[PDB]
Amino acid sequence: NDRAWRQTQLKVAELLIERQPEVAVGYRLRRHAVWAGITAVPMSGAGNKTPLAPMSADMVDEYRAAMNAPDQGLWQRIEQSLTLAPYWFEGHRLSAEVAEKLGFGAVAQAIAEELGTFLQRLPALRELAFSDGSPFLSPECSRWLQPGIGEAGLAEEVAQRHGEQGIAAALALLDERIAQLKEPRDRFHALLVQAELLAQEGMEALARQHYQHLWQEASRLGLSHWEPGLVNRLESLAA
Amino acid sequence: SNDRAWRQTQLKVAELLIERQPEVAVGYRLRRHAVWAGITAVPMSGAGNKTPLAPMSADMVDEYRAAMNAPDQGLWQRIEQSLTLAPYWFEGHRLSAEVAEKLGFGAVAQAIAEELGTFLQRLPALRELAFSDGSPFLSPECSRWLQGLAEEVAQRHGEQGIAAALALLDERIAQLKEPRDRFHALLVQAELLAQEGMEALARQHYQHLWQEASRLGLSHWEPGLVNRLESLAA
Amino acid sequence: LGTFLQRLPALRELAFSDGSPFLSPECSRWLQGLAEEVAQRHGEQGIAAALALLDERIAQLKEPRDRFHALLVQAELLAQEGMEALARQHYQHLWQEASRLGLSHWEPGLVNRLESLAA
């Protein structure tokens, strides 16, 4: 009766979450319960597609709707579903986004550590798709998962002002700083902030585009033979 | 000093062409040429684009704003005669069009607008300047009066705030395969950052844009764009 | 264990009845500005210690930009000591690895000083 034991895990996870919903372990115990019996991916064929239809758009949209005014109640129905919709990897991205907005960084964190785990157990999943052809793992769902001294001296000096006033002022500051810089290295750092800043406001395409021009502008300057760590991240970012 | 009489001449005839027919454009249109043709290049800006020119006495303007609900032909004449002595006071040219739009002179307002639009397109440097007391040449509600990407985006920048625009710019890039498209998209991002008031951040974006064009060899292919980009980085 | 320690910062500092710490400095490792540091080590032990310390630092410094300061350290050290000759020598083989790596197009202060602080 793996079935019954699996109940029990969930039961304990329900309760753990109920008692402490800012604390990972319950979330973790559930993922397990849900992805226990799974030993090898579902039978696929034409275009990697699987005989399993995706999450009811209606349903997904409705969830994406609530996001602006999210509560501890939303988060529960999301989760209820990804307990019944094993492979819905996009919902594990929501759960993480929701949780992060409700104030639970650590749980978001965990939701993902545990997913990345599942994908290393059976990576065939990173390629599979639902009978409608849509991917088990989107590209925005996969960038999610993949992981200076004076650089952070401003970046942290700014992401602070990005919290007191909004993005508008964040940039406003970034500007007034740059006007008083001589060294290109610094000015390149600034522009680098601008990108990171847009990343946190939800500008995945506009941010990435700055990384592209920052990686090449660096590689062009031959920083692979001096300060290659900078260049190596820049490369990872621009994906 | 002889083109003094020539300008006055152009005005008298304007005065007349309107007296005889207040519902017909040309009169008003000539009045413009009397005032803006002598203007060949913009005035010397200083501390925050303040040009050493005084503005329209706010009291004298309040008065015109007062009268706006109950508008007569005598009001309209004083707006216009004022906007004859304060060449760059573009708010007057909105007030004239509003006066004219209520008084049923629908194609005159249109004209009053097209003619400004013309002048601004000629010396676009004016859009950003302002008077000694920092009151804008092209004012807030006046640029709204005269309004595919920088088209659609700076449209969204005025309606919603800046973030909504940046938000859109983002979802446009999402589909812009060819580097030309992308290059423009980042070019907009820059314009928009100057339109929000961070000059040096846009300058820094323009510097890397021209140096990127120059290196792609666009000077022998879209030299217009590369020579615009060049000055914007001064 | 990292979290449990992060939930209560005090548990680290504590010790049992017998004064034996809850968390050893051995266990804390299981979980967890050079000229500033070492230019004072020169006032204490002699110049010979200032170099012995500089050695253990460069043991791990995978970024050559760090190292260039680490050799810029070895330069500063000898310069202040009185050895003005072996000094300028070191500031030449540094100034030229700059013009080589293209540092007039990046961090060009470093350069402009390095030249008049060598010729």
Author numbering:
A (entry chain C): 230 to 376, 383 to 474
B (entry chain A): 229 to 375, 388 to 474
C (entry chain D): 344 to 375, 388 to 474
What does the paper say about this structure?
The structural studies presented here show that TssA1B, TssA2A and TssA2B possess structurally diverse CTDs that lead to distinct overall architectures for their respective complexes.
We also provide the structure of an Nt2-CTD TssA2A construct, demonstrating that 10 subunits assemble into a complex with distinct five-fold symmetry rather than the six-fold symmetry seen in EAEC TssA2B. The structure of crystals of an Ah His6.TssA2A Nt2-CTD construct (R232-K478) was successfully determined to 3.13 Å through molecular replacement using the coordinates of the Ah TssA2A Nt2 dimer as a search model. This identified the position of five dimers of the TssA2A Nt2 domain (R232 to L374, helices α1–α7) in the asymmetric unit, which did not appear to be arranged with any obvious symmetry with respect to each other. The remaining C-terminal residues of each of the 10 subunits (chains A-J) were organised into a separate domain (the CTD) consisting of five α-helices (G388-L472, α8–α12). In the first, a two-fold related interface (shown by PISA32 to be 530 Å2) is formed primarily through interactions between residues from the extended loop linking α11 and α12 and the N-terminal end of α10 and their symmetry-related partners. This revealed that in the decameric Ah TssA2A Nt2-CTD complex, the Nt2 domains are not related by the five-fold symmetry exhibited by their corresponding CTDs.
